[PDB]
Design a binder for this molecule. Structure first.
Ligand SMILES: COc1c(C)cnc(Cn2cc(C#CCC(C)(C)O)c3c(Cl)nc(N)nc32)c1C
Ligand SMILES: [Mg+2]
Length: 209
């Protein structure tokens, strides 16, 4: 059973701006997603200090970057805290309203899209490179869910029947046809070294041959 939801209007606006604005420095999407993963890992790590059983769903804290040329996907996997259904449907959109407004105002006053993370809405930069984003997530207190959106004002959420992931988040970027450079090992390595070299969790870049 797939449920379909409308984004908050301000978030639909933001996604349209990200999709429509001419802006060549698209590579910053990766830093933003990796930062989100790091923050999610920090959260579970801290909670585990007071309740060690929170790592019963997995003790490894890491980030994997997985390109797949045949599927034209780049997947950012973390074993962080994960998101609940309420996060996916309501809470993330609600908290993002203020940051989205501030970002759009800053852009009008001379900021650029690479500053998106300063406003707490860097996830949406995925739409610089992806025509569709699928997010598979599992929080200790909730079931495994799949969220998905191709923009256009709506997103879907369903319970995920796929491979159970233990705990964490997988952001699957279905890349646009002209954005396949982000499947290349030398390109991803370049970007991680430039913008994510000090992240406090192991980042493993998977390869293909
Ligand atoms: C569903 O797609 C998203 C949307 C629509 C918005 N932002 C985000 C970014 N985001 C947000 C995370 C979170 C959370 C809730 C807590 C309480 C952990 O802050 C969160 C978490 Cl835990 N992990 C990661 N990797 N990204 C997260 C995503 C993935
Ligand atoms: Mg919304």
């Amino acid at each position: 059973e797939v449920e379909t939801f409308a984004f908050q209007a301000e978030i639909a606006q933001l996604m349209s701006l990200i999709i429509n604005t001419f802006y060549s420095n698209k590579e910053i999407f990766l830093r933003e997603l990796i930062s989100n993963s790091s923050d999610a890992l920090d959260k579970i790590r801290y909670e585990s200090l007071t309740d060690p059983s929170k790592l019963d769903s997995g003790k490894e804290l890491h980030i994997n970057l997985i390109p797949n040329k045949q599927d034209r996907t780049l997947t950012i996997v973390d074993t962080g805290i994960g998101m609940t259904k309420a996060d996916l449907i309501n809470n993330l959109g609600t908290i993002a309203k203020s940051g989205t407004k501030a970002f759009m105002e800053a852009l009008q006053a001379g900021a650029d899209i690479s500053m998106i993370g300063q406003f707490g809405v860097g996830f949406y930069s995925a739409y610089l490179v992806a025509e569709k984003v699928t997010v598979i997530t599992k929080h200790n207190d909730d079931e495994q869910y799949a969220w998905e959106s191709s923009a256009g004002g709506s997103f879907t959420v369903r319970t995920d029947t796929g491979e159970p992931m233990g705990r964490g988040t997988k952001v699957i970027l279905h890349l646009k046809e002209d954005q396949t450079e982000y499947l290349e090992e030398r390109r991803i390595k370049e970007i991680v070294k430039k913008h994510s070299q000090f992240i406090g969790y192991p980042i493993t870049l998977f390869v293909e041959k």
